[PDB]
């Protein structure tokens, strides 16, 4: 469990994807990551994320669990760092799913937000009926609380 996450931990920052930054272990348990998450999409893409993504002891049977602790305004995320993200959902999780893949997944999920079902159905509604102004509504939440951008 420890084995398989160490082995994925070090492929990854050796080879990181451009939008994962500062991956690491915590300074103590080897099961819980943080990375900031870089996204793309405006205006998320002025600041960067920080993210805990924490591996049970029953990894890879069980999923893994990503929340964000960076606060950050976005339909598909509430307001403690929550997210859904299917292919770590119990229903969709295959132990030969990687780490990297759900990272990928999340990232795709960040800059393309799911109107369809989202978390923060208001926000959902906003982006398809004012874009602009949910985009200043992003943007004042990403300045005022998102990690200054490497």
């Not at 999780?93 to 893949?101: E, L, M, R, S, V």
Request: aromatic share 8%; hydrophobic share 35%; charged share 25%.
């Amino acid at each position: 469990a420890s084995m398989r996450v160490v082995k994925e931990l070090e492929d990854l920052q050796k080879k990181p994807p451009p939008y994962l930054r500062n991956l690491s272990s915590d300074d103590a348990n080897v099961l819980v990551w943080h990375a900031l998450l870089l996204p793309d999409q405006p205006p998320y893409h002025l600041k960067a994320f920080n993210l805990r993504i924490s591996f049970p002891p029953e990894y890879p049977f069980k999923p893994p669990m990503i929340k964000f602790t960076t606060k950050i305004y976005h339909p598909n995320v509430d307001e403690n760092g929550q997210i859904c993200l299917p292919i770590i959902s119990s229903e969709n999780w295959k132990p030969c799913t990687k780490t990297c893949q759900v990272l990928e997944a999340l990232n795709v999920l960040v800059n393309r937000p799911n109107i369809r079902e989202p978390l923060r159905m208001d926000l959902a509604d906003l982006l398809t009926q004012n874009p602009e102004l949910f985009r200043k509504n992003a943007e004042e939440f990403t300045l005022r609380f998102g990690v200054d951008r490497p």
